């Protein structure tokens, strides 16, 4: 079972297409680690890390990212509701997001962040 964990570069990105999400995946057929490149609605590019890890793996990344420490806590609460199919988690600036099927939860915290991460089962 391993989740695909992407880190949008940006503080304003609230979605990946289907597009952006089939770039993600491709890149993830030959390695678990990449780098994709990804426009904004304005048209600018934004760099995105994508990660195709385990639990335990994906717990290790949360523990080893430059943010704080509230913001690891929602990560790792929270990243066993991306493991099941068809249920995304959006941690941002905002705070937490869960789109199960567009979306059905938001809870706002401020924990810092000043990037988006995606979690997702592939």
């Not at 890890?53 to 991306?82: F, G, Q, V």
């Not at 937490?96 to 979306?103: A, V």
């Amino acid at each position: 079972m391993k989740l695909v964990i992407a880190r949008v570069k940006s503080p304003k990105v609230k979605r990946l297409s289907e597009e952006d999400i089939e770039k993600i995946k491709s890149a993830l057929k030959s390695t678990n680690k990449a780098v994709v490149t990804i426009k904004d609605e304005n048209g600018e590019e934004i760099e995105v890390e994508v990660r195709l890890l385990t639990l335990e793996e994906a717990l290790k990344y949360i523990n080893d990212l430059p943010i704080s420490n509230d913001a690891k806590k929602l990560m790792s609460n929270n990243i066993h509701k991306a493991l099941e199919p068809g249920r995304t988690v959006v941690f941002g600036p905002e705070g937490c997001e869960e789109r199960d099927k567009g979306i059905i939860k938001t809870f706002s915290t401020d924990v810092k962040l000043d990037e988006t991460y995606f979690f997702f089962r592939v």
